């Protein structure tokens, strides 16, 4: 079968529409499924409060343009965007975006990255979690309360102060390992590596996940494993980390 | 090298995104390169001159969003868009887009569907064509003239009809095959199997092209074509027709 | 499903564990069925007549030790060794290694290189051939008089004189678009790239078919299209020439 | 750049042609290296003591027969039969056989499964460890043995009683995890869950790494793993396990 998968992105948003697809192409390798991927776009250069909301409006007009091409999935990416809206906004969000496409014939399982990341956490069955975003201190603040205020504890953060989103996507992964073993991470039960979908990851995960011995998510895997659960299909993804391989 | 691929398609459209990355997928087997996929849509859901014209003017938009995430190449899907707006458009819509992407500081190569097919023609040294649209006849007789205008002869032609874009993805490629050979292919250089971006033919390519015992090309093909060799890289792409082999 | 390919190599053979894993790596991309590969070997390094006999006689061996495996298919590579034989040794060969897998409890269906191209070129419907070979002349005439022999006319062709197997397996492969040429093309039904199974092919496979505009066939395509039919499995390998495509 | 991987495999050994290939074609997604894989066979259909030393006689013919291809790396593969033979005799093997290669003008770097999985434990820095084999008891005791004489300390061990060298290849991996689940893990460093070549263990690798919280090998990785380090290079390998991730 062939499984159209739909992705809601900033238009600058680079990595979301490489992992993902990594990922999937790797799940190939192992279960007979084969993916297409489709991007409608919402204009977005800098992360700013203020350039998130208006983000945020095309919202809609992004999964109007994704239903016309009847998708399986809709993965509406941008994590800060939605819990800079208010405390469990990603609940309204996919609500109002499933509304959308049914406004539209076309009634399709819409996944945010940030349901996607409390989900994953639980799934895992992790109460206390540490976190490394690229964002400016206040945003990353928003992103941590936004997780302690859905019942998950945060040990220790990190903000790697980064507005310019094209530069958040030319961070090296590899600077991470070192990052997270500078991190009190022993406290904690799982290690949220990307805490933000431009921020590449994938392949320090696994490397990470061995040096740490605690498990690793990022958004894209946790995005990847909401919207393989939501077409009732196993979770089993080489390089996806602890998440991606019989959790589902 | 990780080459980025920016793809401005219509919302309905799920044949670009489909056959390109295949392509693409293919030449990873084949050439060192590889490749990430990026979209931008545009509202459309039927194939009719007046939503043809709508579409083109959301061009623009589209090529802003695409050039906000620093995109190594631009390809417009929907020759039948430009071939509508009157001959020789393929060039105005190349120079207006290019114009774009660099006052947004990201200056990149695009390529339309319809300049791709013309140069793909070319560059096979093909002067006769077969073509193959699922459009209309009023909207088949666009393309064809356009053709023509370009300086190469079109001999026989078929329309399919179908005017519901959602239809004209959901047929069946193996049709083609038999569809071709009830056509004059013997007096003619080379196949057009498809003069669409919507209609699926790749599966069908090399299966016709043996059968036939002459060049088949898609307007898929082309823009692939048209990119590697915008970005001076090796055509060979195994499964992509003659035009995809030390093309050409 | 997971096929398992047998294949019986010359010991100093390198390149029909490279080409047609690469040709079934392809399917993969169109088709559900994976593959694994298994090979067995026959010492032999130098191509002579007197150590192609001996090689054949190892022949047996081999087909115990791949059929101790379970093995779907049986590849016996290297045609020369068969033709070499005298006429008609492609069935003979056949015959008595199916019954040696048979007589060890797991009767596969076995194929001869020889066999393979003979049968090959008939499904084109060719009846002339060109033909182009890494051997010494004697050797070359063998395969070309046993081609006409099987009912099929050798119109052009041409030895490349190379009798060290190593050097065979590190010739350019780039060479024989141009080598094929400056051949007589024209007049011939379709084009044997490689009467060899250790000259590299696969590269310049739809390159030489794109010039020629003539169907090309190398022993590795054959072997392979030749397994797929003795499995009921479709035939379309992408970038595999005119022979593996809804083949033929 | 191309890499030729050399195996020395037991007749009816099906896994090692899977779980090698399966490894490095997923690691072609991470690193540019690409492979190619080359076997040259032993017979034997029965693991048993006198089928075991009988099929090391062969191991230097097989090691001649590869060399013939000028290989990158030599797996020789099964790894009871080495323990079988006598304390630390895996360092004896790979001498001897590097011998044979020499003697052949092909020098190439030899690897045993027996010891790429003590060099694999020691490499994780685990000083105890758990066992899975599917061989009959007294056959494993001499692989727990051979192993606490490394120096390393051996846990929980279980023989899962399969002498049928096929019954063990079609052993599913889907039971591995429930095994091991039922085993003392905790006092453990890692997990060898296929101290065994023959036995599937890839497609539960990650899952049982997972649920178990600990670094998890078989004899396949740490093959890999080996011959990944001997040709120099990175042993990022997704699905891979703990062993296969910045491990070198």
Redesign the interface.
Known sequence: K?V?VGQIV?????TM??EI??LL??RE??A?ERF??????????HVTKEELARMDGDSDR?A???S???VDVMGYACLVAIMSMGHGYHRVSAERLRNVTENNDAATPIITSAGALIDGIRALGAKRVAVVTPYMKPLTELVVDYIRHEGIEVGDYRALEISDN?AVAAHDPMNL?GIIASMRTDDVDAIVISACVQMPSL?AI??V???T?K?VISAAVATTWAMLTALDLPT?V???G?LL???Y
Do not use: W, Y
């Not at 900033?10 to 680079?14: D, E, H, K, L, M």
């Not at 297409?36 to 250069?45: E, I, L, P, V, Y």
């Open positions: 062939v159209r900033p238009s600058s948003n680079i529409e490489t697809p990594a192409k790797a390798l192992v007979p297409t991927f489709h991007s409608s776009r919402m204009r977005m250069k992004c109007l343009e994704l016309d091409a009847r094209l390992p392949n696994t490397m996940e061995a040096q011995r498990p089993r080489p390089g996806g602890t391989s019989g959790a």
